[PDB]
Design a binder for this molecule. Structure first.
Ligand SMILES: C#CCN(Cc1ccc2[nH]c(N)nc(=O)c2c1)c1ccc(C(=O)N[C@@H](CCC(=O)O)C(=O)O)cc1
Ligand SMILES: C#CCN(Cc1ccc2[nH]c(N)nc(=O)c2c1)c1ccc(C(=O)N[C@@H](CCC(=O)O)C(=O)O)cc1
Ligand SMILES: C[C@H]1O[C@@H](n2ccc(=O)[nH]c2=O)C[C@@H]1O
Ligand SMILES: C[C@H]1O[C@@H](n2ccc(=O)[nH]c2=O)C[C@@H]1O
Lengths: 264, 264
């Protein structure tokens, strides 16, 4: 996509070499922002082939509150296996913080049905936030939340969302995280009878690992293709009632897949 | 400053008209980021006289983990009055979250000591974050945090910071928060023997109240002058024992103050 390829060229032209926990080495810039107007097409990268099947099942899993990879295995998704313990558990990550964030006095807040009552009854609220970054449970988590915090906004009968991603692997993770959120925004907009506004992405430490460099320049040599289209064949009673089958992507013509190692 | 004046102009040009919770009405955009290189000078506005005495007692009040306006009345700063109760408490806002975030199991987390040790023992960390958006305790706060989340970063011996502001009064609140956070990056860099880097400001619902149009046009017609320079006169034993005496600004020659009505 024009925004994505421009970002990669920006950490390659402006990035500094860092070191990290996986010990792999990275080129890194700090602070970046881009916008996808969702009326223009579903933001799924066309200059390498992406696997939607993993993106829809991961999102459906987050919305059910589940944090054990059993659901994901049932559906042939293996994206979280490396971080999951003996029993499939990932600890209190995204799904749990979203559906049941624990309070000091034993309550639990459901941040997804809350954001939906705000979109319905007070869409002009400046408080329409969901946060996965609970400081109090980070130590019990498999990996610390990358897509940490996000906020919805309504303007001319259209729903917009801004994510703050504190750490971004531009080659491997970012294709995934922007199609995940663009898909959450069509689901909230279908439920609130609103149109789709924009997906604003904001990055903290936005980087490219050293062992993703030739791949990065291979992708960068491709001309982006026309952006796909999301067709939803049903309007479930709730945001928690979607199924994989209700989602169709039309017009998707990517350049060939590019393979690359995942850091530990 | 040029970055700040441009956002004022982006909200008047592009802003949508919204009805906010005070009934006053706002010119509003969603999603904006501004980068400040703190080597080029202290980012205090010069097209209107900003008052650093309130900016600095509030930040030392925050680092103390105090949520009561008592200390703030002793130093003649009146910014928190109409939101405190009849005993002076604001409930667990910023300072309580920064110094003592409560787990569901009794314990507390000191996010500034956590960040101090990360900049001194793991400076390449992509988790150098402090958050004040505690979803369990939002009910308990006199006002939900506007400056909700921030992340530090170190690259070639420089300390950077990025703040996410979910709500921003451009004419009134924004000069205050830019000076406040840029001030903390100097404190942190001084304790951690680092040089100062960029101050990335990202905003969600960025807005200008309708009753602030006159003052905006007045300020938008004034030319930005040289940024001040900040001096920290002595080096304290920790970040917790600084005082108002320790801070100074040479070369700050601003335009007159500009008086504006506050909305509640
Ligand atoms: C983001 C996210 C969720 N996640 C979780 C997640 C966890 C740790 C991480 N660690 C690193 N180094 N990079 C990541 O982006 C990352 C992502 C993902 C997990 C696997 C793949 C992956 O291996 N990629 C594809 C290859 C093609 C593609 O990029 O889609 C694959 O399925 O093999 C992607 C995302
Ligand atoms: C941001 C923040 C913290 N805060 C808290 C805070 C809380 C609620 C708010 N509500 C509204 N409507 N706008 C705000 O900017 C705002 C700010 C502030 C409090 C007061 C001033 C203010 O009125 N500044 C005046 C007078 C202060 C002075 O004399 O120094 C000025 O003209 O500078 C700014 C920020
Ligand atoms: C933890 C490492 O994987 C990256 N990562 C992880 C999860 C995710 O949603 N997106 C992403 O890019 C961040 C960092 O490079
Ligand atoms: C809640 C109202 O006050 C504003 N507000 C509050 C605190 C702060 O630091 N900055 C700011 O702009 C946001 C909105 O106009």
């Amino acid at each position: 996509m024009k925004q994505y390829l421009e970002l990669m060229q920006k950490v390659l032209d402006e990035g500094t070499q860092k070191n990290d926990r996986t010990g792999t080495g990275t080129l890194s810039i700090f602070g970046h922002q881009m916008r996808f107007n969702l009326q223009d097409g579903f933001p799924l990268v066309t200059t390498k082939r992406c696997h939607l099947r993993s993106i829809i099942h991961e999102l459906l899993w987050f919305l059910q509150g589940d944090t054990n990879i059993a659901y994901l295995h049932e559906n042939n998704v293996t994206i979280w296996d490396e971080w999951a313990d003996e029993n499939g558990d990932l600890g209190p990550v995204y799904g749990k913080q979203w559906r049941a964030w624990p309070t000091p006095d034993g309550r639990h807040i459901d941040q997804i049905t809350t954001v939906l009552n705000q979109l319905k009854n007070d869409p002009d609220s400046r408080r329409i936030i969901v946060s996965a970054w609970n400081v109090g449970e980070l130590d019990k988590m498999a990996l610390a939340p990358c897509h940490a915090f996000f906020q919805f906004y309504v303007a001319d009968g259209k729903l917009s969302c801004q994510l703050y991603q504190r750490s971004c692997d531009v080659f491997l993770g970012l294709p995934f995280n922007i199609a995940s959120y663009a898909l959450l925004v069509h689901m909230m907009a279908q439920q609130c009878d609103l149109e789709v506004g924009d997906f604003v992405w904001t990055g903290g430490d936005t980087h490219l690992y050293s062992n993703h460099m030739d791949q990065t320049h291979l992708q960068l040599s491709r001309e982006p293709r026309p952006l796909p289209k999301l067709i939803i064949k049903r309007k479930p009673e709730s945001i928690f009632d979607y199924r994989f089958e209700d989602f169709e992507i039309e017009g998707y013509d990517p350049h060939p897949g590019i393979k690359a190692p995942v850091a530990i």
